[PDB]
């Protein structure tokens, strides 16, 4: 059945709740972003109103064939009325088109649902600064102090410098980057830019990227693999067997692969700085796991919450075990006692 942390009290609304059939009492289904664990259940046969960003609505129409009459895109940073309730969509700093949602309940309660997010100090100067938030529905993916990672800017600097050096030493090297969803486009786009190449990919993935409103995208991507020396493949193919296979397909144009797997966190982060990352190598194939995250680190999450000072926190991630739930609640209480709210 639909869990309570997907329902907005005092409304008929749900958030990321498309796999439970008809939720009794639901007049409007919000979708924070186009990732499969959140959209699971949507299709051309859906006949209730879906509220989301413009980019998410492009993906619903083109990838899932949801009928246009049920897609309700909202502009960001704009007070809107939905079924008699004021709402605002804010940028979540997650993947393209991802939003947080501010609900202003008729009784005076203000609720923020972060969706998935990477907390940032820039959020402290949005429309959130303007009123008090009472309840926070929080993306707790990495809510434990072991989870540190570098800035996205540091990680892209590492990837650009690594790729540029490799291809300048060997102009017959191919760069490959893995993907299994939208998000993390900066990785492959930054590397193609420094090398003077377009990124080559499948027709399915090209279609997906053409929904994202990224400026000048026609200049950066292509379905012609032969004309490109940065290729995108499914994340599942980023291993020695899959890469050896791919190299066969390129017909002797290339004699080396340098491949990137943008993981979330990996326990090399507890010890290893970004400067010190090394690849796994077999023969003429090297694989780099780089910690490019689109979720908050522990410290970024803590700063956001201690700034916002909510009265009540409802976690939306890691809620399935008692040990996880009790650990998170202990951190929430520390943060509140340290900051004095
Ligand atoms: Ni996500």
Coordinates of C-alpha atoms and ligand atoms in Angstrom, one line a residue:
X1 CA 0.0 0.0 0.0
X2 CA 1.2 3.7 -0.4
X3 CA 3.5 4.6 2.5
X4 CA 2.7 7.6 4.7
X5 CA 5.9 9.4 3.8
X6 CA 4.5 9.7 0.1
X7 CA 1.3 11.5 1.2
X8 CA 0.9 15.3 2.0
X9 CA -1.4 15.9 5.0
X10 CA -4.3 18.2 4.5
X11 CA -4.3 17.7 0.9
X12 CA -5.4 15.3 -1.7
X13 CA -1.8 15.0 -2.9
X14 CA 0.9 12.4 -3.3
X15 CA 4.6 12.6 -4.3
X16 CA 6.4 9.9 -6.4
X17 CA 3.5 7.5 -5.8
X18 CA 2.6 5.9 -9.2
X19 CA 3.1 2.1 -8.5
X20 CA 0.2 1.6 -6.0
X21 CA -2.7 1.8 -8.4
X22 CA -5.4 4.3 -7.6
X23 CA -4.5 5.9 -4.3
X24 CA -7.7 6.6 -2.5
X25 CA -8.3 10.2 -1.8
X26 CA -5.7 11.5 -4.4
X27 CA -6.6 14.4 -6.7
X28 CA -3.1 15.3 -7.9
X29 CA 0.0 13.1 -8.4
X30 CA 3.3 15.1 -8.3
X31 CA 6.5 13.7 -9.8
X32 CA 9.8 15.2 -8.6
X33 CA 12.1 13.8 -11.3
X34 CA 12.4 11.3 -14.1
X35 CA 14.2 8.4 -12.3
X36 CA 12.6 4.9 -12.5
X37 CA 12.2 4.3 -8.7
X38 CA 10.1 7.5 -8.6
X39 CA 8.1 7.2 -11.9
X40 CA 7.5 3.5 -11.7
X41 CA 3.9 2.8 -12.8
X42 CA 3.4 5.7 -15.3
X43 CA 2.5 4.9 -19.0
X44 CA 0.2 6.1 -21.9
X45 CA -2.8 4.5 -19.9
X46 CA -2.5 6.9 -16.9
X47 CA -5.6 9.2 -16.6
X48 CA -5.0 11.4 -13.5
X49 CA -3.3 14.9 -13.4
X50 CA 0.6 14.7 -13.1
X51 CA 2.3 17.8 -11.9
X52 CA 6.0 18.3 -12.6
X53 CA 8.7 20.4 -14.2
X54 CA 8.7 21.3 -18.0
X55 CA 11.8 18.9 -18.5
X56 CA 10.1 16.0 -16.7
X57 CA 7.0 16.6 -18.8
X58 CA 9.0 16.4 -22.0
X59 CA 10.3 13.0 -20.8
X60 CA 6.8 11.8 -19.8
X61 CA 5.4 12.7 -23.3
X62 CA 8.4 11.4 -25.4
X63 CA 9.8 8.4 -23.4
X64 CA 6.7 7.0 -21.6
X65 CA 4.0 8.3 -24.1
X66 CA 1.9 9.8 -21.3
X67 CA -0.9 11.8 -23.0
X68 CA -0.5 15.5 -23.1
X69 CA -3.9 16.3 -21.6
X70 CA -2.7 14.7 -18.2
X71 CA 0.7 16.5 -18.1
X72 CA 0.7 19.7 -16.1
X73 CA 4.2 21.3 -16.3
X74 CA 4.9 24.2 -13.9
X75 CA 7.5 26.9 -14.1
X76 CA 10.1 27.1 -11.4
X77 CA 10.3 29.8 -8.7
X78 CA 6.7 30.8 -9.3
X79 CA 3.7 30.7 -7.0
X80 CA 1.1 28.4 -8.6
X81 CA -2.4 27.2 -7.4
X82 CA -3.2 23.4 -7.7
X83 CA -6.6 22.2 -6.6
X84 CA -6.9 25.2 -4.4
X85 CA -3.5 24.9 -2.7
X86 CA -0.5 27.3 -3.3
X87 CA 2.7 25.4 -4.4
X88 CA 6.2 26.4 -5.6
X89 CA 8.7 24.2 -7.5
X90 CA 12.4 24.8 -6.7
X91 CA 15.6 23.5 -8.4
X92 CA 16.8 20.4 -6.5
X93 CA 20.4 20.3 -7.8
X94 CA 19.9 16.6 -8.7
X95 CA 19.4 15.5 -12.4
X96 CA 17.9 17.6 -15.2
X97 CA 14.3 18.6 -14.4
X98 CA 14.5 17.6 -10.7
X99 CA 12.5 19.7 -8.3
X100 CA 11.7 20.2 -4.6
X101 CA 8.1 21.2 -3.8
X102 CA 6.9 23.8 -1.3
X103 CA 3.2 23.3 -0.2
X104 CA 1.4 26.1 1.7
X105 CA -1.5 24.3 3.5
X106 CA -4.8 26.1 4.0
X107 CA -4.4 25.8 7.8
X108 CA -1.0 27.8 7.7
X109 CA 1.4 24.8 7.8
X110 CA 4.3 25.0 5.3
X111 CA 5.8 21.7 4.0
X112 CA 9.0 21.2 1.9
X113 CA 9.4 17.9 0.0
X114 CA 13.0 17.8 -1.2
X115 CA 12.5 14.9 -3.7
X116 CA 16.0 13.7 -4.5
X117 CA 18.5 16.7 -3.9
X118 CA 22.1 17.7 -3.5
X119 CA 21.9 20.4 -0.8
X120 CA 23.8 23.6 -1.7
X121 CA 24.2 27.1 0.1
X122 CA 22.6 28.6 -3.0
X123 CA 19.3 27.2 -1.7
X124 CA 19.5 29.5 1.3
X125 CA 18.8 32.4 -1.2
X126 CA 15.8 31.0 -3.0
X127 CA 12.1 31.5 -2.0
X128 CA 12.8 29.2 0.9
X129 CA 14.4 32.2 2.8
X130 CA 11.0 34.1 2.8
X131 CA 9.0 32.0 5.3
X132 CA 9.2 29.3 8.0
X133 CA 8.9 25.6 7.0
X134 CA 7.3 23.4 9.6
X135 CA 7.7 19.8 8.1
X136 CA 10.6 18.6 5.9
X137 CA 10.3 15.4 3.7
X138 CA 14.0 14.8 3.4
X139 CA 16.2 12.8 0.9
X140 CA 18.4 10.9 3.5
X141 CA 20.3 8.8 1.0
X142 CA 23.8 9.5 2.5
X143 CA 22.7 10.4 6.1
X144 CA 25.8 9.1 8.0
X145 CA 29.1 10.8 8.6
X146 CA 31.2 8.3 6.6
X147 CA 29.7 9.8 3.4
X148 CA 32.1 12.5 2.2
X149 CA 32.8 13.4 -1.3
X150 CA 34.4 16.2 -3.3
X151 CA 32.6 19.0 -5.1
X152 CA 31.3 18.2 -8.5
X153 CA 33.7 20.9 -9.9
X154 CA 36.8 19.0 -8.4
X155 CA 35.6 15.7 -9.9
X156 CA 35.1 17.2 -13.4
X157 CA 38.5 18.9 -13.3
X158 CA 40.0 15.4 -12.5
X159 CA 38.1 13.7 -15.4
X160 CA 39.0 16.5 -18.0
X161 CA 42.7 16.5 -17.1
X162 CA 42.9 12.6 -17.1
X163 CA 41.2 12.3 -20.5
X164 CA 43.1 15.2 -22.2
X165 CA 46.5 13.8 -21.0
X166 CA 45.6 10.2 -22.3
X167 CA 44.3 11.1 -25.7
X168 CA 47.2 13.7 -26.3
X169 CA 49.8 10.9 -25.4
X170 CA 47.8 8.4 -27.6
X171 CA 45.6 9.9 -30.3
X172 CA 44.3 6.3 -31.0
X173 CA 42.7 6.1 -27.6
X174 CA 38.9 5.9 -27.2
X175 CA 37.1 7.4 -24.2
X176 CA 34.0 5.5 -22.9
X177 CA 31.5 6.8 -20.2
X178 CA 28.8 4.7 -18.6
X179 CA 25.1 5.7 -17.9
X180 CA 21.8 4.1 -16.9
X181 CA 19.6 7.1 -16.3
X182 CA 19.5 10.8 -16.8
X183 CA 21.9 12.8 -14.6
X184 CA 25.6 13.4 -14.6
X185 CA 25.7 14.7 -18.2
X186 CA 28.6 17.1 -17.2
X187 CA 31.0 14.1 -17.0
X188 CA 30.7 13.1 -20.7
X189 CA 30.0 16.6 -22.0
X190 CA 33.1 18.2 -20.3
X191 CA 35.4 15.4 -21.6
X192 CA 34.0 15.8 -25.2
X193 CA 34.5 19.6 -25.0
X194 CA 38.2 19.4 -24.0
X195 CA 38.8 16.8 -26.8
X196 CA 37.0 18.6 -29.6
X197 CA 34.6 15.7 -30.2
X198 CA 30.8 15.1 -30.0
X199 CA 29.6 12.4 -27.8
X200 CA 28.3 9.4 -29.6
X201 CA 25.5 7.3 -28.3
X202 CA 22.5 5.1 -29.2
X203 CA 19.3 6.5 -30.7
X204 CA 17.4 5.8 -27.4
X205 CA 19.9 7.8 -25.3
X206 CA 20.1 10.6 -27.9
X207 CA 16.2 10.9 -27.8
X208 CA 16.4 11.2 -24.0
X209 CA 19.0 13.9 -24.0
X210 CA 17.1 15.9 -26.7
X211 CA 14.3 16.3 -24.0
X212 CA 16.5 18.1 -21.5
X213 CA 16.7 21.8 -22.7
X214 CA 20.4 21.8 -22.5
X215 CA 21.8 24.8 -24.5
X216 CA 23.5 24.1 -27.8
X217 CA 22.9 20.3 -27.4
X218 CA 22.8 19.8 -31.2
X219 CA 26.5 20.9 -31.1
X220 CA 27.6 18.3 -28.4
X221 CA 26.0 15.0 -29.2
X222 CA 25.4 12.6 -32.1
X223 CA 24.2 9.1 -33.1
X224 CA 27.2 8.8 -35.5
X225 CA 29.6 6.7 -33.5
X226 CA 32.3 6.7 -36.3
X227 CA 32.7 10.5 -36.1
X228 CA 33.1 10.6 -32.3
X229 CA 35.9 9.6 -29.9
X230 CA 33.9 9.8 -26.7
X231 CA 31.2 7.0 -26.6
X232 CA 28.4 6.5 -24.1
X233 CA 27.4 2.9 -23.2
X234 CA 25.1 1.3 -20.6
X235 CA 26.7 1.2 -17.2
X236 CA 26.5 -2.7 -17.4
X237 CA 28.9 -2.7 -20.3
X238 CA 31.6 -0.8 -18.3
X239 CA 33.8 -3.9 -17.4
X240 CA 36.7 -5.6 -19.1
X241 CA 34.6 -8.1 -21.2
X242 CA 32.2 -5.4 -22.4
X243 CA 34.9 -2.9 -23.3
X244 CA 37.0 -5.5 -25.1
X245 CA 33.9 -6.3 -27.1
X246 CA 33.1 -2.7 -27.9
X247 CA 36.7 -2.1 -29.1
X248 CA 36.3 -5.0 -31.6
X249 CA 33.3 -3.1 -33.1
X250 CA 35.3 0.0 -33.8
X251 CA 37.2 -1.8 -36.7
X252 CA 40.9 -0.9 -35.8
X253 CA 40.3 2.8 -35.4
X254 CA 41.4 2.6 -31.8
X255 CA 44.0 0.6 -29.8
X256 CA 43.3 1.7 -26.1
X257 CA 40.2 2.5 -24.0
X258 CA 40.0 4.8 -21.1
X259 CA 36.5 4.4 -19.4
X260 CA 34.7 6.3 -16.6
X261 CA 32.1 4.9 -14.1
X262 CA 30.5 7.8 -12.2
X263 CA 29.4 5.9 -9.1
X264 CA 27.7 7.5 -6.1
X265 CA 29.8 6.8 -3.0
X266 CA 32.5 4.0 -2.8
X267 CA 34.6 3.3 0.5
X268 CA 37.8 4.4 -1.3
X269 CA 36.4 7.9 -0.2
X270 CA 37.0 7.3 3.6
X271 CA 40.8 7.2 2.8
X272 CA 41.5 8.4 -0.7
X273 CA 41.5 12.1 -1.9
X274 CA 40.5 12.8 -5.6
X275 CA 44.1 13.6 -6.5
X276 CA 45.0 10.0 -5.5
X277 CA 42.3 8.0 -7.6
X278 CA 43.8 5.2 -9.8
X279 CA 42.2 3.0 -12.4
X280 CA 41.7 -0.8 -12.7
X281 CA 43.8 -1.8 -15.7
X282 CA 43.9 -5.0 -17.9
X283 CA 46.0 -4.8 -21.0
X284 CA 45.0 -1.7 -23.0
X285 CA 41.8 -1.0 -21.0
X286 CA 41.7 1.2 -18.0
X287 CA 38.5 1.9 -15.8
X288 CA 38.2 4.9 -13.5
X289 CA 35.4 4.9 -10.8
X290 CA 34.9 8.6 -10.0
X291 CA 32.7 9.9 -7.0
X292 CA 30.4 12.2 -8.9
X293 CA 27.3 12.5 -6.6
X294 CA 23.9 14.1 -7.3
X295 CA 22.9 13.6 -3.6
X296 CA 23.9 15.5 -0.5
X297 CA 26.9 14.5 1.5
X298 CA 26.4 14.1 5.2
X299 CA 27.8 17.6 5.9
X300 CA 25.9 19.3 3.0
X301 CA 22.6 17.7 4.4
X302 CA 23.4 18.8 8.0
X303 CA 24.1 22.4 6.9
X304 CA 20.8 22.7 5.0
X305 CA 18.7 21.3 7.9
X306 CA 20.5 23.4 10.6
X307 CA 19.8 26.5 8.3
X308 CA 16.1 25.6 7.7
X309 CA 15.3 24.6 11.3
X310 CA 12.2 22.5 10.6
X311 CA 9.9 21.4 13.4
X312 CA 9.5 17.8 12.1
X313 CA 11.7 15.7 9.7
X314 CA 10.2 12.8 7.7
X315 CA 12.9 10.7 6.0
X316 CA 12.2 9.3 2.5
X317 CA 15.3 7.1 2.0
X318 CA 16.7 4.2 4.0
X319 CA 13.3 3.9 5.8
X320 CA 13.0 0.1 5.5
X321 CA 15.1 -1.0 8.5
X322 CA 14.8 -0.2 12.2
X323 CA 18.5 0.3 12.6
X324 CA 18.6 2.8 9.7
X325 CA 15.5 4.7 11.0
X326 CA 16.9 4.9 14.6
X327 CA 20.3 6.0 13.4
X328 CA 18.8 8.9 11.3
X329 CA 16.6 10.0 14.2
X330 CA 19.7 10.2 16.5
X331 CA 21.5 12.5 13.9
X332 CA 18.4 14.7 13.6
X333 CA 18.4 15.2 17.4
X334 CA 22.1 16.0 17.5
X335 CA 21.7 18.6 14.8
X336 CA 18.8 20.3 16.6
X337 CA 20.7 20.4 20.0
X338 CA 23.9 21.8 18.4
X339 CA 22.0 24.5 16.6
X340 CA 19.4 25.3 19.3
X341 CA 16.1 25.0 17.5
Ligands
LIG1 NI1 17.0 10.2 -8.2

